[PDB]
Design a protein around this nucleic acid. Structure first.
Ligand SMILES: COc1c(N2C[C@@H]3CCCN[C@@H]3C2)c(F)cc2c(=O)c(C(=O)O)cn(C3CC3)c12
Ligand SMILES: COc1c(N2C[C@@H]3CCCN[C@@H]3C2)c(F)cc2c(=O)c(C(=O)O)cn(C3CC3)c12
Ligand SMILES: [Mg+2]
Ligand SMILES: [Mg+2]
Ligand SMILES: [Mg+2]
Ligand SMILES: [Mg+2]
Lengths: 245, 487, 487, 247
DNA sequence: ACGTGCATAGTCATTCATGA
DNA sequence: TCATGAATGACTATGCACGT
């Protein structure tokens, strides 16, 4: 068991449960999203750490500069473990580390910067499956009489719309289907009922299979060699749609 | 270089600031209970179509529209004013429908302008009801490009409902919010008893307005302070939150605070208790835990020691925290461009007067527009009775001006009427269409007679205020939140 | 809970970011030379009516309109983008007419959004010319509420004119600005010699585009770098400011810098000289004084020591400061949704292709609308020829549909024609108005004949591009600013 | 008497002049970062310095002295003027013989002027007594004639006067662009500020004079003091007659 | 000394590629 | 290491009156 703040980052909205095994850290993109997340959370088991701005690339940046970064210190401190050789999983303050970013591309980019931080400084957190990715909603279907439904894809949107109409429900063509363009646009209630309620949230657990293959990919994508990255993007962007086919 | 004495400069400059702040910034107009920034936001959103019958527009568009046409000040503080009008813990009756993160009763600040969307609420639509029928005076904006309203129709007593607080120069206001249904009763009485003197009116209105009704619920302790505010325009109203004592399986007792008095920051409240214990001055408390959530609302659990009495600890909280705190009422509002401290019967009366003004002006506007149309229709009917001639006359005219001048001479009609005949489509020459014009004339002359009747009878005018207000209250009126108890 | 491999996540996420940044953020479309934010700001201003024929609107209204409908990002950085497009030292041909403080070539930041006003410039109106005539493909915005243009008509070669600089992923662009009159000559040649191969075209275009033309004037030293940039898509162009040696009364030779190379901060430049002097890297300098003002422009006076040669000190300034600095050209633009490094002949050719597309599409749109209007007029002329019958038929009709159906039977007309007749006003039955209808039909059939001729002859299509662009250059074209010298 | 100007121990926001002679130097105390920015650009950098003040100035009448000296904006003024305050005041060390207060024409500009004039009268009175303090009068209107040079107006009256004369003279204005109305210094560019408030050959300055020192002491205490009641009765008593102070 | 609400925005740190 | 330019806003201090 570990003490919660009521010696940690100022932006950390810690949980109440003193058991790491039962605790969860939501690393959130933006002060706005983090603010509403702080309100909709379960304050017992869920803590919020809002990260502001693009995270520093630890692959590119010198080590001393990374340690001066206010946002990295927030993560390293709030996780408690330590980094590199001084890493100690025993001091992990949250056994669930959920990265929650916007569905847009800059959200995707921030996650790749965080996954890089974790893989390089605190790799065992990934290997032992403590790192997760929350999937935010893309749409909110606001039925005229029925309860609202949330969708996490264009496909699911079309599916819930079709089913509902077939079931005799109806929607306004003005208000209609609210489309989320980021977590910042969501209020406390919406975030709970889509990303933080453990009975309905869609989490993805980051797994690490081939460590050597991962090591090279991180260096190619996040490294200082532009040439290697430029040829990689031109080589593989052509086939991103077919990675899971 | 001209010389100026420091006394002349200081006096002129500071008085100009104080007067503008007093009349045109910090204090509410008595008729609609709005400050200039409030009124200008709402009209901007209204004119922009940001209404409840359409989806929320990005709130940035409301700020920018306000800035560009009406409110020559900063986007930052204007956004703050808009956000406030959308918070259910600030306004007893929110005027803005916010979408997104608009903050909390604690220290959680609202999301930035870019993240949030907003539109007018249905009640705010009653603030602006029939503003387009010359129901209120308009003046040119800050650069004469466009017109802005001096006051809103305000078809529900907004000043008393949502209250107002403002710091001006030499003075400040602090009007608490009230329950709409209770205010409506006061207005209904004021309409029926329109001849009653101030002495009788104050007695009646105080009987119906039982006291302020805060959006944050809570308790009002005592009746003296409330009575003072209504008879004096000043009064200290003691508020309390609600505390429920819970017992534990072991046996230990804990206090649960689920409501706090109006305008008490939840985070500052919890911190104050912690800091007093940590200072060691609220003994008997064993632990402070905020079990609040979006789903249970406010829930501050104060576990107390076994050698501690629940009420002793509660009384200490009343004494040393804002669990019990007073509302300094000061009924200050601008009346006819002048700041005035008002009695409760004055606040109602002035509002009722405003409603009657609004409806007489609306009636006047409709009567004028009815007469204009009735006069254009009369011209068309003349044309139909001589339709054979009318057409042949236009056909046999070189220009349209020659056709027009001919129409006046033939049918003995105005140039406005003759124009309407010319502007008439070949559609309306159909049999059933000729008949619509006839019936419409008959339809309007009945409406003109009705409208003339309303203006001639103060009884009907008062009835319209009553009947229209009753509709609003039946729609948007809600239960009381703040419970009133005695000492 | 679903499992995901870190390699799969990293690759998909980073590629998606890289591709969006590349195609939809950092790099310009080759046809109009605009990035998404530019295109959306300008269209927002255009659609809001913020045009040169109306007074400057508050810039907040442009940001909000862009943000609310087209550009789902922060108000802050969008304002920066709008501001930049209004600065004469940034854009060679500003697209925004700024009113107020928009900063300076030094460290003076622009005024906040609240203090500034803005509208489109006449040249920006040429970017958007006839966009409402289906000249470019439109797609739904970020939430499908409204349509936005994929590219602007861009009736002057904006990419080459105003240039572009952008940092993407895996690549970056840096296209210098050019003199409009020189670009037009290149375009005129490309139109005349439309069959010319790339080898000939590149030779011709390079002869007319003598080199970059920076808004900050200055000098271009050498011709190799310019030649490389146009043949390779990459080249290092050596720039210089202008230095004039003045001699004093007491005898105090001093260097006066009145121009600096493109994108050199005035304040950072002075600071660099000042810091490299007290350090011991620029001996011979005695004193640095900034005699710049709004009325004389840039004027940095560098007094040199008496035992110092002016030319020695100037070469030292060339070496150790940005008084001489290179422009790293990298002609990268998005071509058909794909990033491409282009030769100068490709940049011109691709633009000419776009202009021809715009005019063929404009002609097709006008021909369609002409046929529709012609059709309706043909119906009206039939009605006038049988005007006696038309009227008597509508009078004796129960409904308008019965009158309509009758008109079809009488004149053998479409339902669109009969409706147009029905909607006709008695206005138009006057003699001159009946004749106006006749002549209008004749006018269109002449215009239809013209339009059909345009579509059938590529010669005329090219002619329209030339003639219309020529008009634009004669009005908005200006002298060269950057002087080109040899080694 | 000459003093060094900053060029790559004075306030950071200060944009100092080049002239080392105080007798020829001028300090423009400006309201707002935007306006101060434009002033820095439109000025004559030889004789004119700019000090932008941000936000409403602290009331030295109400606040304790220790709090006033901790205020970043007051420290900037006291430092830039160089003299010192109260008993340690030394006019000999005055770095500018012209201290121009430039605020918006709006009501909030007037308020800032009273807060600055209070600071000067209480901390550095001799600057007022010796006529070193001035008030710049910003323009209210810019008349943009179609063919002729644009004219600036400093009142509703002058606007009406210049408009009539020009129209009578055969000039013309657009009814769209037309007459630009300034709502603050922040809306002006560098050129406009030069041609109305900073160019010494056309600027409209007012020199602050001090006649009755005892009466001034009382007015300052009434308007700016901690006594609200005294201020409330004074405003209600005299606001009714502000229009008629110069009739 | 703190809260209140309408008024009077610059500063601060990263991604990303390239050349000094 | 710094500039470039679109991307990912909270904090900082005064006026003003009033009550604990
Ligand atoms: C620089 O002025 C402001 C400060 N400053 C006051 C002090 C001055 C020196 C720097 N430190 C503080 C910061 C502040 F803290 C907040 C705001 C503010 O919120 C605001 C708005 O439109 O909402 C507008 N302004 C500006 C119009 C002046 C604010
Ligand atoms: C808080 O993030 C920002 C910083 N901060 C990032 C760092 C975090 C810790 C504190 N220090 C830095 C400051 C900054 F300096 C500038 C901007 C900024 O300009 C901006 C915009 O709309 O233009 C938007 N944002 C936010 C959307 C992220 C900025
Ligand atoms: Mg986002
Ligand atoms: Mg503010
Ligand atoms: Mg920014
Ligand atoms: Mg102002």
């Amino acid at each position: 068991a570990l003490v919660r703040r009521k010696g940690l980052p100022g932006k950390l909205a810690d949980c109440r449960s003193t058991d790491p095994r039962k605790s969860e850290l939501y690393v959130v993109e933006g002060d706005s999203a983090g603010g509403s997340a702080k309100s909709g959370r379960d304050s017992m088991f869920q803590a919020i750490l809002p990260l502001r701005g693009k995270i520093i690339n630890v692959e590119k940046a010198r080590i001393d500069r990374v340690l001066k970064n206010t946002e990295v210190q927030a993560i390293i401190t709030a996780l408690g473990t330590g980094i590199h050789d001084e890493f100690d999983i025993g001091k992990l303050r949250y056994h669930k580390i959920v990265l929650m970013a916007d569905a847009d591309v800059d959200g995707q980019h921030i996650s790749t910067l965080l996954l890089t931080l974790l893989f390089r400084f605190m790799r065992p957190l990934i290997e032992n499956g403590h790192v997760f990715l929350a999937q935010p909603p893309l749409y909110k279907l606001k039925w005229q009489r029925s309860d609202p439904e949330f969708a996490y894809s264009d496909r699911e949107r079309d599916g819930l719309l079709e089913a509902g109409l077939k079931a005799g429900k109806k929607i306004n063509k003005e208000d209609g289907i609210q489309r989320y363009k980021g977590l910042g646009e969501m209020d406390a209630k919406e975030l709970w009922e889509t990303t933080m309620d453990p009975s309905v949230r869609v989490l993805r657990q980051v797994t690490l299979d081939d460590a050597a293959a991962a090591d090279e990919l991180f260096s190619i994508l996040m490294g200082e060699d532009v040439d290697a990255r430029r040829s990689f993007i031109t080589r593989n962007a052509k086939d991103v749609r077919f990675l899971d086919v | 270089i001209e010389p100026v004495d420091i006394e002349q400069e200081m006096q002129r400059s500071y008085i100009d600031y104080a007067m503008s702040v007093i009349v045109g910034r910090a204090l509410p107009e008595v008729r609609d209970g709005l400050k200039p920034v409030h009124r200008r936001v709402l009209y901007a959103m209204f004119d922009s179509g940001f209404r409840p019958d359409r989806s929320h527009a990005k709130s940035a568009r409301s700020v920018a529209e306000t800035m560009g046409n009406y409110h020559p000040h900063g986007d930052s503080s204007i956004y703050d004013s808009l956000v406030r009008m959308a918070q259910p813990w600030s306004l007893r009756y929110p005027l803005v429908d916010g979408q997104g993160n608009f903050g909390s009763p604690g220290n959680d600040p609202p999301a930035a302008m870019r993240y949030t969307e907003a539109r007018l609420t249905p009640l705010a639509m009653e603030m602006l009801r029939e503003i387009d029928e010359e129901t209120v005076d308009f003046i040119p904006n800050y650069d004469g490009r466009v017109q802005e309203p001096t006051v809103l129709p305000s078809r529900f007593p907004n000043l008393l409902a949502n209250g107002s607080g403002g710091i001006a120069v030499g003075m400040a206001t602090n009007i608490p919010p009230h329950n709409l249904r209770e205010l409506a009763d006061a207005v209904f009485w004021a309409l029926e008893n329109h001849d009653a003197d101030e002495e009788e009116t104050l007695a009646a209105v105080m009987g119906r307005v039982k006291g302020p009704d805060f959006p944050t619920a809570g308790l009002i302790v005592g009746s003296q302070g409330t009575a003072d505010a209504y008879k004096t325009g000043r009064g200290s109203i003691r508020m309390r939150g609600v505390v429920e004592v819970e017992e534990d399986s072991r046996g230990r007792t804990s206090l649960v605070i689920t409501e706090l008095p109006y305008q008490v920051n939840h985070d500052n409240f919890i911190t104050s208790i912690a800091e007093q214990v940590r200072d060691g001055k609220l003994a008997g408390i064993s632990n402070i835990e905020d079990q609040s959530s979006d789903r249970v609302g406010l829930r501050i659990v104060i576990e107390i020691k076994r050698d501690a009495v629940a009420k002793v600890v509660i009384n200490n909280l009343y004494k040393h925290t804002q669990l019990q705190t007073s509302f300094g009422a000061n009924m200050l509002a601008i009346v006819d461009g002048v700041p005035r401290t008002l009695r409760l019967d004055q606040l109602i009366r002035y509002y009722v007067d405003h409603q009657l003004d609004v409806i007489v002006r609306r009636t006047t506007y409709r009567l004028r527009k009815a007469n204009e149309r009735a006069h254009i229709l009369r011209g068309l009917v003349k044309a139909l009775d001589a339709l054979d001639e009318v057409i042949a006359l236009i056909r046999a005219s070189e220009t349209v001006d020659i056709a027009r001048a001919g129409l006046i001479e033939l049918l003995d009609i105005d140039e406005i009427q003759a124009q309407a005949i010319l502007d008439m489509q070949l559609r309306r020459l159909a049999a059933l269409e000729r008949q619509r014009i006839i019936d419409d004339l008959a339809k309007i002359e009945a409406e003109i007679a009705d409208l003339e009747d309303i203006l001639a009878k103060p009884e009907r005018q008062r009835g319209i205020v009553r009947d229209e207000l009753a509709e609003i209250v039946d729609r948007h009126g809600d239960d009381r939140r703040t419970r009133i108890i005695a000492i």
